[PDB]
Design a protein around this ligand. Structure first.
Ligand code: HEM
Length: 184
């Protein structure tokens, strides 16, 4: 179940966030913690491609080696708050699971600056969801969370100390695929 109406950053700068570059998940918190593994790798690219607002996602379970990419077209609900219907693709953008009704996620950018961000997502895959999932992002895959984003976590009435880090999982990412998937 998802339970939070995440508030987007006041003054969110969409063009900076959606600049075509990659964001790495460095830390995450699911309010239903058993919905996701305790060790995980994830990253995304976010950009406009030929006028269309896009995200490309990468997920990797470093223990099971379960790997998948997704491409999403985002619709705007309000500044910094989106609804994304996804298609599962291979790394080259070939469709494995087409877009469908019931497969979507909400995506809210709660905090962002040039190097860091705090997001919320609620994933729906038919009548299943993956709970309220918060993620701390950085442009540098190895960056420890700094005070701007940790303060944003606090401002969301969350505690950064409860977030699970992705840093001890030997995560390795194909940035080229993420960037190229924005066009697909
Ligand atoms: C950064 C933001 C994220 C977004 C927007 C997001 C989005 C999604 C989407 C769209 C899917 C479905 C993929 C498909 O079936 O084609 C998915 C699945 C999944 N995500 Fe995330 N995700 C994010 C971060 C994470 C993180 C950090 C974890 C942490 C553990 C995670 C764990 C999972 C798992 C375990 C699944 C598989 C669900 C199932 O098998 O049905 N995700 N995610």
């Amino acid at each position: 179940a998802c339970t939070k109406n995440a508030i987007a950053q006041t003054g969110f700068n969409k063009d900076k966030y959606f600049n075509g570059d990659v964001w790495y998940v460095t830390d995450y918190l699911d309010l239903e913690p058993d919905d996701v593994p305790k060790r995980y790798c994830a990253a995304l690219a976010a950009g406009t491609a030929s006028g269309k607002l896009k995200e490309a996602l990468y997920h990797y379970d470093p223990k099971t080696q379960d790997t998948f990419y997704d491409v999403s077209e985002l619709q705007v609900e309000s500044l910094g708050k989106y609804t994304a219907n996804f298609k599962k693709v291979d790394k080259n953008g070939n469709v494995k699971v087409a877009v469908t009704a019931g497969n979507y996620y909400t995506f809210t950018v709660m905090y962002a600056d040039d190097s860091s961000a705090l997001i919320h997502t609620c994933l729906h895959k038919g009548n299943k969801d993956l709970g309220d999932l918060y993620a701390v992002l950085n442009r540098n895959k190895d960056a420890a969370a700094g005070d701007k984003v940790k303060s944003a976590v606090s401002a969301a009435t969350l505690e950064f100390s409860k977030f699970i880090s992705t840093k001890e999982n030997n995560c390795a990412y194909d940035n080229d695929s993420l960037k190229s998937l924005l066009t697909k």
